[PDB]
Amino acid sequence: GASKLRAVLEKLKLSRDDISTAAGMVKGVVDHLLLRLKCDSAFRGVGLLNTGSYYEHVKISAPNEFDVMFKLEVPRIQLEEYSNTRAYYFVKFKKENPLSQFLEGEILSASKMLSKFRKIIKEEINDIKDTDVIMAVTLLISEKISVDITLALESKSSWPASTQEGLRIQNWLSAKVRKQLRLKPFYLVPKHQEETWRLSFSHIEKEILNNHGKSKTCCENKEEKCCRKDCLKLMKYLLEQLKERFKDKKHLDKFSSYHVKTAFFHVCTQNPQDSQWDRKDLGLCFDNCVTYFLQCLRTEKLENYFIPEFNLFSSNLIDKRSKEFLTKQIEYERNNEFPVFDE
């Protein structure tokens, strides 16, 4: 039952001290690269974007994966939507800006900026090579710790129209809160071909996770302890284990913590009351997350949390057989009392 899930979470709590030291190994490399990129004309206004829990600047995507986001303040920015994709945009300017070396008429080239960014990193990684670190931009600190670095364009302007019906937290976190979060900046990340940038809102996650209840006092006292974070921790861990178990057959390579997070938060909108997340119902709640995620896998529909018209589970992004492989693996883990959590 819930007892089994609790022992998994307690096991995960002890490995938190090893990924706090690993977060430090990542922070040293990132601070070294930041003062290196800041001396450059193009990356003069480069800064670190705080997205997670460790130092705020470092995030976690898998047992050894780390996510770092380098922001770049881009004032006087005009966005042009690409072929009604709702998430992808061309970057255009409204004077003598430092970003001028990557322009092609009016369109700011993503590949041209990511080339200079990647080269400076590849250059200082060989400079301070007395700390084992090798190669959007992925590094590997001491044959174990993997770190994915992302160059983001910060826009302090209002969120584009595609987001209007996104962040449906009004009935959970409130309308007052949605308005305040929508006052925060948004980020543009190069696309994974065209010179387009994708809307990123990863920085908003830390805001909601540390203030996740309908009640302001959620998880501040024993009498109001919910199982929201625990369901996300268990949903994330389930995929990490499945990805490790089938790293041999490549079908789970496209699926990430991002898909697990999106689906979990959609269940938060679905279940806005803290009573729908009681700590005694850990098993029941985790299953509702598993069921919605399996419904997403089967229907080939997982909506971006900030852009409803953008499908993360589109045939274009992830193939149907990759989705059916995860559907049958999870369905099995559900029908075998989760043996991937065996200890």
Ligand X SMILES: Cc1cc(Cl)c(-c2cc(C(=O)O)c3[nH]cnc3c2)cc1F
Interacting residue ranges for ligand X, rule: CB under 6 A = 200-202, 204-205, 208, 258, 261-262, 265, 305-306
Inter-axis angle of helices 18-37 and 110-127, nearest 10: 110
Residue nearest to ligand X (CB): 204
Any idea which residue has 């995960």 for tokens?
12
Q: Which one, 5 or 232, has the nearer CB to ligand X? A: 232
Task: Report the residue number, 12 or 218, with the smaller CB distance to Zn ion.
Answer: 218
Query: Using CB distances below 5 to 8 A depending on partner kind, what does residue 262 bind out of Zn ion, ligand X, none?
Result: ligand X
Write down the least CB distance from residue 229 to Zn ion, Å: 7
Answer whether 214's CB lies under 8 Å from 273's CB: yes
> Which of ligand X, Zn ion, none does 150 bind, CB closer than 5 to 8 A by kind?
none
Q: Does 146 count as an annotated binding residue? A: no
Residue 213 interacts, among Zn ion, ligand X, none and using kind-specific CB cut-offs from 5 to 8 Å, with Zn ion
User: Would the annotation count 199 as a binding residue?
Assistant: yes
DSSP 219-276: TTSGGG-B-HHHHHHHHHHHHHHHHHHTTTS-TTSS--HHHHHHHHHHHHHHS-SGGG
Task: Enumerate binding residues for Zn ion (CB under 5 A).
Answer: 213, 218-219, 226
CB of 87 to ligand X, least distance (A): 9
Closer residue to ligand X (CB): 10 or 253:
253
Q: Which is nearer to Zn ion, 33 or 169 (CB)?
A: 169
CB nearer ligand X, residue 43 or residue 305: 305
Q: Least Å distance between CB 39 and ligand X? A: 29
Is there a binding annotation on residue 249? no
The residue ranges of DSSP E strands in the chain, in sequence order, are 46-49, 59-60, 65-73, 77-81, 88-93, 103-104, 107-108, 133-134, 137-141, 145-155, 186-190, 197-200
Q: What distance in Å separates the CA atoms of residue 260 and residue 263, rounded to the nearest whole number?
A: 5
Q: Choose the one of ligand X, Zn ion, none that binds residue 219, judging by a C-beta under 5 to 8 angstroms depending on kind.
A: Zn ion
Q: How many CA atoms lie within 13 A of 118 on its CB side?
A: 12
Amino acid at 97: N
Cβ of residue 258: shortest distance to Zn ion, in angstroms?
22
Considering the complex, what minimum distance in angstroms separates the CB of residue 16 from ligand X?
A: 20
Is 261 assigned a ligand-binding role in the annotation?
A: yes
Could you tell me the smallest distance in angstroms from the CB atom of residue 304 to ligand X? 7
Find where tokens 């994974």 sit.
192
* Closest distance of CB 228 from ligand X, Å: 11
201 binds, among ligand X, Zn ion, none (CB under 5 to 8 A by kind): ligand X
- Work out the burial of residue 49: count CB atoms within 10 Å of its CB; fewer than 13 is exposed, 13-18 middle, 19 or more buried: buried
User: Residue 282, SS3?
Assistant: helix
Tell me how far apart the alpha carbons of residues 80 and 274 are, in angstroms, rounded to a whole number: 40
Which residue, 255 or 338, is less far from ligand X as judged by CB? Answer: 255
Alpha-carbon gap, residue 169 to 84, rounded angstroms: 25
Question: Are the C-beta atoms of residues 32 and 26 closer than 8 Å to each other?
Answer: no
Give CA–CA dist 327/318, Å, rounded.
13
Exposure letters 120-154 (e unless 16+ CB within 10 A, then b): bbeebbeeeeeeebeeebebebeeebbbbbbbbbb
The answer on whether 257 is annotated among ligand-binding residues is yes
Instruction: Return the one option of Zn ion, ligand X, none that residue 205 interacts with (CB less than 5 to 8 A, by type).
Output: ligand X
| 204 has binding-site annotation | yes
Query: Tokens 């229907």 map to which residue?
Result: 299
Q: Is 285 annotated as a binding residue?
A: no
Q: Nearer Cβ to ligand X, position 292 or 338?
A: 292
Residues making up the binding site for ATP: 53, 65-67, 202-205, 236, 257-261
Residues making up the binding site: 51, 53, 65-67, 148, 191, 198-205, 212, 218-219, 226, 236, 257-261
